[PDB]
């Protein structure tokens, strides 16, 4: 008795809430790259998606808890938005 589509699996699916971000300045997909520093001691790359307007949206869904530091560089140059830090709170937190 509830709209149930085929998505989430047994192994895994929707862990921690996602993190969408949009660069303030205008960039052109190409000589740009991004990196993510996990608190556990690992690393991962963000998600560079070119919006249907002409901008980009850096999205990175956290897999573990703790503090993660993102590092994005545009054409071999650090941006005024990075580096940055985002704490991963537990799921279904808060009363």
Swiss-Prot record:
Its quaternary structure? Homodimer. Interacts with MICALL2. Interacts with RFLNA and RFLNB. Isoform 1 interacts with FBLP1, FLNA, FLNC, GP1BA, INPPL1, ITGB1A, PSEN1 and PSEN2. Isoform 3 interacts with ITGB1A, ITGB1D, ITGB3 and ITGB6. Interacts with MYOT and MYOZ1. Interacts with HBV capsid protein. Interacts with ASB2 isoform 1; the interaction targets FLNB for proteasomal degradation.
Q: What is known of its domains?
A: Comprised of a NH2-terminal actin-binding domain, 24 internally homologous repeats and two hinge regions. Repeat 24 and the second hinge domain are important for dimer formation. The first hinge region prevents binding to ITGA and ITGB subunits.
Q: Which residues carry this modification: N6-acetyllysine?
A: 52
Which stretch of the full sequence is covered here? 1736 to 1823 of 2602
Q: How is it modified after translation?
A: ISGylation prevents ability to interact with the upstream activators of the JNK cascade and inhibits IFNA-induced JNK signaling. Ubiquitination by a SCF-like complex containing ASB2 isoform 1 leads to proteasomal degradation which promotes muscle differentiation.
Give the linked disease: Interaction with FLNA may compensate for dysfunctional FLNA homodimer in the periventricular nodular heterotopia (PVNH) disorder. Atelosteogenesis 1: A lethal chondrodysplasia characterized by distal hypoplasia of the humeri and femurs, hypoplasia of the mid-thoracic spine, occasionally complete lack of ossification of single hand bones, and the finding in cartilage of multiple degenerated chondrocytes which are encapsulated in fibrous tissue.
Highest taxon of source: Eukaryota
Q: What is this protein called?
A: Filamin-B
Q: Describe where the Filamin repeats fall, as residue ranges on this chain.
A: 8-85
Could you tell me in which tissues this protein is expressed?
A: Ubiquitous. Isoform 1 and isoform 2 are expressed in placenta, bone marrow, brain, umbilical vein endothelial cells (HUVEC), retina and skeletal muscle. Isoform 1 is predominantly expressed in prostate, uterus, liver, thyroid, stomach, lymph node, small intestine, spleen, skeletal muscle, kidney, placenta, pancreas, heart, lung, platelets, endothelial cells, megakaryocytic and erythroleukemic cell lines. Isoform 2 is predominantly expressed in spinal cord, platelet and Daudi cells.
Q: What does this protein do?
A: Connects cell membrane constituents to the actin cytoskeleton. May promote orthogonal branching of actin filaments and links actin filaments to membrane glycoproteins. Anchors various transmembrane proteins to the actin cytoskeleton. Interaction with FLNA may allow neuroblast migration from the ventricular zone into the cortical plate. Various interactions and localizations of isoforms affect myotube morphology and myogenesis. Isoform 6 accelerates muscle differentiation in vitro.
| UniProt family annotation | Belongs to the filamin family.
| Phylogenetic lineage | Eukaryota, Metazoa, Chordata, Craniata, Vertebrata
């Amino acid at each position: 008795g509830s709209s149930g589509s085929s998505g989430v699996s047994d192994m895994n699916g929707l862990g921690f809430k996602p993190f969408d971000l949009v660069i303030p300045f205008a960039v052109r997909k190409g000589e740009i790259t991004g990196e993510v520093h996990m608190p556990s001691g690992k690393t991962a790359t963000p998600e560079i998606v070119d919006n249907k307007d002409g901008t980009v949206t850096v999205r990175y869904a956290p897999t573990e808890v703790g503090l993660h530091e993102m590092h994005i560089k545009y054409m071999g140059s650090h941006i005024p938005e990075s580096p940055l830090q985002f704490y991963v709170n537990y799921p279904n937190s808060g009363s």
